[PDB]
Amino acid sequence: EVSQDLFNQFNLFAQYSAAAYCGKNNDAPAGTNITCTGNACPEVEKADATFLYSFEDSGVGDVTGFLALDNTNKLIVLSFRGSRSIENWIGNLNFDLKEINDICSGCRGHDGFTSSWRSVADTLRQKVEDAVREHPDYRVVFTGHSLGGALATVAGADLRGNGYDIDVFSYGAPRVGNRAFAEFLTVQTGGTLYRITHTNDIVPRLPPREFGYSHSSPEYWIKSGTLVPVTRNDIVKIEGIDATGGNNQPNIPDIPAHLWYFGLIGTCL
Amino acid sequence: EVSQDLFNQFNLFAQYSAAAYCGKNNDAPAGTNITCTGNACPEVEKADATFLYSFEDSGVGDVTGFLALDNTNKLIVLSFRGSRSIENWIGNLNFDLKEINDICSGCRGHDGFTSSWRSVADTLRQKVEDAVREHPDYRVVFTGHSLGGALATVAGADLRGNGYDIDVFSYGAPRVGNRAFAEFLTVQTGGTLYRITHTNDIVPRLPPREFGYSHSSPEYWIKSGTLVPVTRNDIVKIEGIDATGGNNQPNIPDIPAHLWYFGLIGTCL
């Protein structure tokens, strides 16, 4: 359903996200080769990938991850790690909205996530812009899993419109805000946001639409089960704001589904 | 390089070994269906498999596992769970031997696996003997991953000779005794021992050949990577007590490879 090329990209940024969790990238120097423990990022290792700057618990909230240079795929990748302990992070989900008129009029955004980037924006924006200058032919991609996803999304739509495109690949990211913000992320240019979801993943199910929250369009939904390999014939396109037959299907969710995006993610062997 | 039927058996008892860690199996009432959390044992859930006896922390070595009644596959499965943390078990692993002439004359084995089994020997002997009585035509199969693998092997060797075959399926098991116990396990009658290893797995190389420890023959070696699906073509039969060319290779060991046997094992999502 989704093209081979789009599948490869989905696979690659799933591993860049998984790389944020695993092996020597929680705190590191600059210029290091990107490697992961337990085969967590083979496609990244297979490419000429190198660190540019690595961060941890940055700003008011806890922001951890890396900025990467991919000479093979011609990329500048900002990858945000999710939480140290996910199970705890699930139940503590404050369902409050805060207006975000700076990025778009009438938009409402999750207080916890919106303020998280707002506390680190200038320190990382600088280092991305720096890398853009050195490789202005390189595609700027922001990626993340879970809480790392949420950051990448808020970091994206925010830092867009400064002459360079920002693609975003989120894996099991939670809802960020209202219907107007759902419609905004859908039609905003200078980057295409790819929100990847899995079966009954507990994260993108929340916050609920009964709290006024919504998801942007489209939604890329992995229907294949946990610990099952994914093929481009198992990713259905769900176009339309909060349409059913996706992570928005009427049933009971799950946590192990959150840890399987193409491969193992949000945990390390 | 193995038959398909043997492949299916390898897969099923890997899922049975996985079950010993994961799900609501830890201590549930008898006759209740065997299930696991995080797609750890689908093939087991597929079968009419219920618990007969549930045990945990029992014995002097905190022996954990379950006795399983499989009406679909017509099996009686005894499954041994490994350590809760394989790291704090690899580090704390004592390599001191002890006499084991109850099983085979001249054999000496690992004092930890022997004493842990010795404590639960009669008790679990009894409950298998009931299931054999309940189902004379059913196949008695002892299985386990990691530590559990070793226990299963020590049990198999011990309880063979009561008028019913006992097949053993161990996954990434450590070496369990000297040269005498290995040969006994290599050519013993009344049940086949299937010793499964994966790539550069750590545990199967412990304890050292240089501490009075040897491996039973044959070996069934999984060549496919960690987090890579296993086919019949990825398993190779290695012939010979302490043979090389399989897992017994002069290279750097790997912990994650121990956590991937046909599917996720030794850990739960």
Curated annotation (Swiss-Prot), chains A, B:
Record has Hydrolase as a keyword: yes
GO biological process, any? lipid catabolic process
Q: Which InterPro entries match?
A: AB_hydrolase_fold, AB_hydrolase_lip/est, Fungal_lipase-type, Mono/diacylglycerol_lipase_N
User: Quick one: effect of changing residue 146 to A?
Assistant: Decrease in liposome binding
Q: Which residues form the active site?
A: 146, 201, 258
Keywords in alphabetical order, please: Cleavage on pair of basic residues, Disulfide bond, Hydrolase, Lipid degradation, Lipid metabolism, Signal, Zymogen
Q: Please outline what the protein is used for in biotech or industry.
A: Used as a detergent lipase. Sold under the name Lipolase by Novozymes. Engineered variants are sold under the names Lipolase Ultra and LipoPrime.
GO molecular function terms listed in the Swiss-Prot or TrEMBL record: triacylglycerol lipase activity
| Assigned EC number | 3.1.1.3
Temperature dependency: Active over a broad temperature range.
What is the disulfide pattern of this chain? 22-268, 36-41, 104-107
Source species, domain of life: Eukaryota
Does the record's keyword annotation contain Iron? no
Q: How does activity depend on pH?
A: Active at alkaline pHs (up to pH 12 approximately).
Q: What class of enzyme is it?
A: hydrolase
Catalytic activity entry: a triacylglycerol + H2O = a diacylglycerol + a fatty acid + H(+)
Q: Name one Pfam family in it.
A: Lipase_3
Q: Which PANTHER family match?
A: FUNGAL LIPASE-LIKE DOMAIN-CONTAINING PROTEIN-RELATED, TRIACYLGLYCEROL LIPASE, PUTATIVE (AFU_ORTHOLOGUE AFUA_6G06510)-RELATED
Name the protein family. Answer: Belongs to the AB hydrolase superfamily. Lipase family.
Protein name, UniProt field: Lipase
Origin organism is: Thermomyces lanuginosus
